[PDB]
Design a protein around this ligand. Sequence first.
Ligand SMILES: Cc1cc2nc3c(=O)[nH]c(=O)nc-3n(C[C@H](O)[C@H](O)[C@H](O)COP(=O)(O)OP(=O)(O)OC[C@H]3O[C@@H](n4cnc5c(N)ncnc54)[C@H](O)[C@@H]3O)c2cc1C
Ligand SMILES: *[C@@H]1O[C@H](CO)[C@@H](O[C@@H]2O[C@H](CO)[C@@H](O[C@@H]3O[C@H](CO)[C@@H](O)[C@H](O)[C@@H]3O)[C@H](O)[C@H]2NC(C)=O)[C@H](O)[C@H]1NC(C)=O
Ligand SMILES: *[C@@H]1O[C@H](CO)[C@@H](O[C@@H]2O[C@H](CO)[C@@H](O)[C@H](O)[C@H]2NC(C)=O)[C@H](O)[C@H]1NC(C)=O
Ligand SMILES: *[C@@H]1O[C@H](CO)[C@@H](O)[C@H](O)[C@H]1NC(C)=O
Ligand SMILES: [Ca+2]
Length: 613
Amino acid sequence: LRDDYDFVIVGGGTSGLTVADRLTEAFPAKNVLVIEYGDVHYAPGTFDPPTDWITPQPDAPPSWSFNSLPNPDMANTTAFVLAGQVVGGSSAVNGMFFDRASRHDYDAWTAVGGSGFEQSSHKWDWEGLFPFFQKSVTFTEPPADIVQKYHYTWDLSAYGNGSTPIYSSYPVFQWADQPLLNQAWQEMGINPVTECAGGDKEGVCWVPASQHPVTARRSHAGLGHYADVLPRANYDLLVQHQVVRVVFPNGPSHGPPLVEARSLADNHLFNVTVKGEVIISAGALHTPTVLQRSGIGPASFLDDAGIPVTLDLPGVGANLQDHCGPPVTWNYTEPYTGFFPLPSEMVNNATFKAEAITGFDEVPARGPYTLAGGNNAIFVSLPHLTADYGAITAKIRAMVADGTAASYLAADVRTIPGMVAGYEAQLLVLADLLDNPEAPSLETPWATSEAPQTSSVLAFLLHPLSRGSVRLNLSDPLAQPVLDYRSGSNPVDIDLHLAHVRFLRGLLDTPTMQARGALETAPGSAVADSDEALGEYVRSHSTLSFMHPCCTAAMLPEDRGGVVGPDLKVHGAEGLRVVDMSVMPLLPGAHLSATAYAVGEKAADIIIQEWMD
Ligand SMILES: Cc1cc2nc3c(=O)[nH]c(=O)nc-3n(C[C@H](O)[C@H](O)[C@H](O)COP(=O)(O)OP(=O)(O)OC[C@H]3O[C@@H](n4cnc5c(N)ncnc54)[C@H](O)[C@@H]3O)c2cc1C
Ligand SMILES: *[C@@H]1O[C@H](CO)[C@@H](O[C@@H]2O[C@H](CO)[C@@H](O[C@@H]3O[C@H](CO)[C@@H](O)[C@H](O)[C@@H]3O)[C@H](O)[C@H]2NC(C)=O)[C@H](O)[C@H]1NC(C)=O
Ligand SMILES: *[C@@H]1O[C@H](CO)[C@@H](O[C@@H]2O[C@H](CO)[C@@H](O)[C@H](O)[C@H]2NC(C)=O)[C@H](O)[C@H]1NC(C)=O
Ligand SMILES: *[C@@H]1O[C@H](CO)[C@@H](O)[C@H](O)[C@H]1NC(C)=O
Ligand SMILES: [Ca+2]
């Protein structure tokens, strides 16, 4: 471990390793150090040997497990959330669903920053982010036989001729009843989309897997941004170390700070000297933890924590958002026939599963295990799924106009004019986005419809108005934070859930599902028809997290509660940036990992262009 470094990156995760990669290749004379809580682990993909249709990988890398506080507005249910504890971060333990949000979701970032963000040239709208999306991954056309078998569609214009060893691929396998819902979504008027990673994604979407096109092995940041670029002499990595905080010897206006690190083996604490900048990429859950212990956070929490205030930025750990939603479930009253193979074949058929195990080891990889978690989702806009009803967005706009919107934030947040102002800007922008018929409001993925385990649809609330907190355990500040999800704390989220579930129920009415005798098992017509009963149902049967927590160090002006500018520097701190999913101001209508790379690539480009002064 060297005397000093030019760059320290806190967290060897998805964004952090892509930043560390791009910095070391651009500045061969500058030394980068990545400090990682975890270690290097082989990363099994989703549904790899010897699992059954979606069982846990026996040799999975380590992760943090989180149980949030009870969410009273969702029947006190707890949210269960994971975070990868490994070189590669969460992308090493992903479900590998590798989509991007619509162009309008990222346009929303620029709009929510407002004019306070406009004397910078770093635009995080679609036009400013799309080139880095193309840079971030290499996509590969599937074989022709696989195309004519499963009917993948795509448009290479969405990917360009990028060549970064982070792979987006379509498996050479699908379950045999994959076309079932595909046909039924079209009978609901949801239309096929040829390519959904090129910004235009409302309709029925093919989504790729973050995995190698030949071997089907998981692609994560630890390979593509770390292992695959070594040897590289200025690219250092320190494992089994927890970065405690950053310290400014002469205050935050004289930087970069020192990185105070704790060795997880022996608890030995030390400091790393930084010449250039410190980049924090500890993730949406842990970046707030690193800045809070650095005295960079809500002044009142920091006082209650016995931590001296270095920067009073109440956005640190605030504005927590995640994807969540309740299900619609059915059985079949006729036998589920004519499909081979279905997922149950893995548990019914030793021959078939033995072959799947060995098919995965052939070159190229073959059979069921080349599949990750599935490659399909609908993304339906609020106008489309409700027949242009303006009730929800009127409620949002009114709730800002009358000033009651603030009441839905936490009691130590609604009192802060900065936070109310930024929450209000979010809601109006979200109100506009949910009025855009090309902007997804509901996501529903599927790969099979075999009953009973996969005869269900989930109603992903893509753009929640509720907001939560990531805060230090005050008993053990170095332990994992407390997550207060406050799911459903803004009531428009419940209205969205009812609209989404009620749209989804139409699935069972489709000729395709009626041919199969699909019989609704939950919520049922009785519940669905009662705003009070369906409300009760979404509040107690929703999954509170699909493991996409974000926006705890939002890219917003300080007066709107943000923590970083559009250059991703922490407001009021020189030589200190954040680059991970905590910087998004609004949660995107997508799974986050592809965005995490794109954010890493653009943040690296920003950092590079300035250090070539
Ligand atoms: C179970 C699960 C499944 C998912 N499935 C999908 C999916 O199918 N599709 C999708 O698009 N997204 C998915 N995601 C989410 C997506 O992968 C993440 O949002 C994204 O990878 C996060 O990137 P990041 O760089 O912000 O964080 P991470 O990649 O998690 O990076 C944080 C890193 O910092 C390290 N760290 C934490 N604290 C410290 C500290 N104090 N000092 C040093 N290092 C520290 C962590 O160990 C980790 O390496 C999933 C997430 C989970 C948890
Ligand atoms: C990492 O670097 C920081 C910055 O140098 C170290 O923090 C500094 O620690 C010194 C202790 O040597 C603190 O000074 C102390 O102040 C109290 C009262 O103010 C006084 O009673 C002590 O005698 C001593 O002078 C100093 O405040 C502190 N600096 C900051 C900005 O917090 C930190 O210890 C280093 N960490 C490790 C593990 O080396
Ligand atoms: C158990 O699974 C194996 C698949 O590995 C089945 O064997 C295949 O059956 C299909 C018929 O759907 C044929 O097209 C293939 O030629 C067979 N391949 C091999 C390698 O056997 C087998 O039929 C399954 N058993 C049952 C009872 O369904
Ligand atoms: C939430 O917390 C506790 C449950 O043990 C109780 O205070 C409250 O009634 C709970 N709310 C609901 C709706 O269950
Ligand atoms: Ca697999």
